[PDB]
């Protein structure tokens, strides 16, 4: 049929099946089921598979990228589509421990990565001098070498974007409590989680409400399921700036 003649039919067959809201089916389940339909269709040999395990493959927490819903309405609409689906904002932003896991690889420029850090810190931190409850986001970068990661951390400090990583000196063991103080520190703009071993130790030291916002391209991690997660796949790292 036509393109519009099948949009208002595919949603309800999974809307009543999972008994979820509108964004949890149109943006979360329709998008993931489109590629896994396309993946078996674009295969050279195995075209027809049984859909017994198809219903559990689309229920993963990751929101998958959809190339066909990128060239159709452009990058100015798909990022704007994801921005009001899982990046819902209010007038008052509560002091929650927000974690931003962004995927950094060797082809990504430091300056492109630096621009999203400035966007995340501006939107998701209130370091105001008159706050009784200041908050700052936590940032995790993965999939890159330590030498390329240390170059990003060094340039952020020279541009007066003061952060903490739990390592106040050379030879220091990783201390969670410097990151917790940096959450409540007005002079610390954000927190830099170095790796996964320093990640999961920080979750145990936080008792306030915790939110995880993961943005990746191919590689995604295993966040614990009790935390509220947003896992969004994008082509380039520059698309992350327009969502956050």
């Amino acid at each position: 049929k036509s393109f519009d003649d099948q949009k208002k039919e595919t949603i309800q067959i999974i809307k009543n099946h999972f008994q979820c809201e509108d964004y949890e089916a149109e943006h979360y389940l329709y998008s993931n089921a489109f590629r896994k339909t396309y993946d078996i269709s674009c295969n050279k040999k195995d075209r027809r598979i049984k859909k017994s395990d198809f219903v559990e493959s689309i229920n993963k927490s990751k929101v998958l990228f959809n190339i066909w819903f990128y060239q159709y309405e452009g990058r100015k609409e798909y990022l704007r589509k994801l921005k009001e689906s899982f990046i819902r904002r209010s007038v008052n932003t509560s002091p929650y421990a927000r974690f931003f896991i962004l995927e950094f690889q060797d082809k990504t420029d430091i300056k492109t990565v630096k621009d999203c850090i400035y966007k995340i810190q501006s939107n998701w931190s209130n370091l105001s001098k008159r706050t009784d409850r200041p908050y700052s986001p936590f940032l995790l970068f993965h999939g890159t070498s330590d030498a390329n990661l240390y170059e990003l951390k060094n340039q952020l400090f020279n541009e007066d974007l003061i952060f903490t990583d739990g390592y106040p000196f050379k030879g220091s063991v990783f201390t969670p409590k410097m990151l917790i103080e940096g959450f409540s520190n007005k002079e610390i703009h954000f927190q830099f989680i170095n790796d996964i071993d320093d990640f999961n130790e920080t979750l145990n030291s936080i008792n306030i409400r915790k939110e995880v916002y993961q943005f990746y391209t191919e590689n995604c991690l295993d966040i614990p399921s009790q935390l509220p997660q947003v896992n969004i796949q994008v082509k380039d790292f520059a698309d992350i700036k327009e969502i956050v």
């Binding site: 921005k83 990046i87 904002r89 209010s90 007038v91 008052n92 932003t93 501006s122 939107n123 998701w124 209130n126």
Partner: peptide
């Protein structure tokens, strides 16, 4: 009047 670039007063 806002703390973010999305929802404002």
């Amino acid at each position: 009047v806002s703390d973010n670039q999305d929802v404002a007063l």
